[model samples]
Target chain A: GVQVETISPGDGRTFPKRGQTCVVHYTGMLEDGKKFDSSRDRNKPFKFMLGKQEVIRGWEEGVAQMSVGQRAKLTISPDYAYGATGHPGIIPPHATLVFDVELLKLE
Target chain B: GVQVETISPGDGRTFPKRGQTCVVHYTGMLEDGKKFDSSRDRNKPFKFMLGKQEVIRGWEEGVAQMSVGQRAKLTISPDYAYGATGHPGIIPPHATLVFDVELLKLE
Candidate 1:
């Protein structure tokens, strides 16, 4: 339910596994190309443990394909994205999603 | 020129030492008691490595004295606070600061 395109492939040394921490910079947008949120705007990267459902399904699935220093653009279907009764003001119901994400660190 | 009062003392098993990561909930205010920033409002705990200069001087000193589950009110002087060029709109120049902080975890 998602398509991932690698903008820049990583060095391939380290991939974030479950229970390991990940640090990333990301811009999340709607299908219409309007930005809903960006970690870059806040001047802080996001950090969470991988495969823990700490984030959305799209992130867990899509980011697993990434290695350290990788950059990717992901297209996620609504089923894999926010389905019915979406994220309130930020996302509408059953909306597909797009993201420009960079894997900065696997801590 | 700062005073720290323990609103609720923590279970003294663990104290966040320098170079350790800490998670906390906090509210910040000016001398006259106007609110400025709060991690509680965001519903996210602020996490940082102690003594890394990732935060302000007052936070470094104040939080070092805290343990897991500790809650404290801190009164910080301008020198220990944001002095000279303050936080612009959020905090004025040479402003003293107050913070009610709770240390939730030390990682």
Candidate 2:
């Protein structure tokens, strides 16, 4: 809620079907500026096949909305986020998701 | 290479020194009744928490020789096999763990 408050509201416009590889760079942070994960730092782009149930709901929707090379800062509510079985190390359950993501390519 | 070959010929007594959390599973056959990994048909069994750099060298010296429901079968090769990276869809990066392992409770 500081700078770049660009929320891609959920309207069901961007949704990947199935078996589509989604490539991107992402940085996940808390409401604070503390970094949890960063693809840019990993030096390898994150690759996830869309509609494969490998990611949370908000991601599947948000990334589906962007064109190749498009970037957006997503504020994902817990419902579309890590739900209950949250990511162990970095993400906690009931936590909101703040992801600055770039859609590199959609396979 | 034929039937029930227990090839754990490394050195050092059973490993699992760091933080041991050993579990079990069975099956991984050659589709020729060989079987790969299985844990009583996924009824919740295997768990391992042995040595830190504490596996390999034939499964950290064969599950540190096993105990407490100790029932295992391992045949890992490739200087331990899967040296270049294998388990992608099933595992990741040089997969070599066809363990008919059953060493419950080693925390």
Candidate 3:
């Protein structure tokens, strides 16, 4: 029961199979546009194995929509974000979030 | 030029040689005895290879002082802790740290 905002259309980046891993550049923000995280800030992209569910659900679904070299902005409700429990000081329970993601490279 | 408090003396858990992996149970706190991080809460001990520098200096030296099945408590100065940069909201810069640690297993 939420809305979706896909700012950039994808040309279909190959999605990693359930057991595979993918590398990505991502930025997560609060509703006020205050950034919480950005792979770019680390000076290195991050790699995560898929289906192991290491990241939040919104990120998993969002990355699934990306194509190689594709970029997009995602608006997610808290349920798909950090959820009711939240992540202590870093995130508030049931808070809305926004993300700007770049599907840089896949492995 | 400060003091050290070893709450639980070690049974001499052999220090992991460089490149060796050691599993540990740890609880870290600030000067007021407020816990900041704990492996117990995660329900599983954590393992890291020695000499990898994946941990702060205090943890490295502290673990080296342990032997298999050894448990100890270490009080540390900030210079031997998170240093000036700190870990953002979670750990303050120049804050003293204390750790209650158990050397679980080695590999």
Candidate 4:
């Protein structure tokens, strides 16, 4: 399961719905805090259709719990992340990753 | 296969890549010239990831050939659409759909 620790609460009552599009800004790192990927690097938010498996399982689940403007740290276990066959040349096998995520827009 | 007839060709050298996001303004219609759905009515754009099957088969192919700011008409057969089992309560069986699609943004 994915773990969520709210860094800063967001306003408004709208959380991401099943089929709605979600835009987020995130910085991903290894369990040891080594930087990996970030949307902030390009200053563009990541957009995807929720519940469509466009993103990882942890992201799909964790992002659903966030409200617009909420910032949280998502501690994703390997079971919910890359799992046994992690991304090659970047993520090692069974890697547990962490992400500082900010929910930007939901529709 | 999807048929593409350009309406007003777009400028710029970029066509949507496989993994890039595409935002379009489209009006879908039945073969009889009945309107079904439109993003223009809501003043919002339709967005999807190209080549991801987020949209219909004809759209995935037709939109790929478009440049930003381009407008085209796409003729989609049932085989490239919902097929024999068309969308219930909306599109009928063996339907031939036409779309006036404007490629608004591509990245």
Model 1, A1-107: lDDT tens digits are: 57889999998878889998889999999988999999999999999886444665667778888889999998886655544335545776557889999999887
User: What DockQ does each listed candidate score?
Assistant: 0.01, 0.03, 0.02, 0.02
TM-score of each model, paired residue for residue: 0.49, 0.45, 0.47, 0.50
TM-score of chain A of each: 0.94, 0.76, 0.84, 0.95
Runs in model 2 deviating more than 4 A are A1-18, B1-107
- lDDT tens digits, residues A1-107, model 3? 13446566556647556666777787888889998889899889888865654665666666776677777787876655544334545766456788887776776
Where does candidate 3 chain A have its weakest 10-residue lDDT segment? A79-88
Write down the worst ten-residue block by lDDT for model 1 chain B: B80-89
DockQ of predicted candidate 3: 0.02
Clashing pairs in 4: none
TM-score head-to-head 3 vs 4, winner: 4
Candidate 3 per-residue lDDT over residues B1-107, each given as its tens digit: 12345555555536667788889888888889999889899999998876655665566666776777777777776555544334546876457777888887888
Rank all candidate structures by their TM-score, best first, as comma-separated numbers. Answer: 4, 1, 3, 2
User: Cα deviation of A99 in candidate 4 (Å)?
Assistant: 0.7
Per-residue lDDT over B1-107 for candidate 4, one digit per residue giving the tens place of the 0 to 100 score: 68999999998578899889899999999988899999999999988896444676678778888888999999987656654334546876567789999998876
True contacts kept of 4: 0.00
Clashing residue pairs in all predictions, respectively, total 0, 43, 7, 0
Report the lDDT tens digits of candidate 2 across residue range B15-79: 44556576655554332344544667778765545444323344555556655454556655423
Tens-digit lDDT track for model 2 on A1-107? 11223434333344445687878889998767689989999799999986555665567667766666566787776545543324545665456678898776667
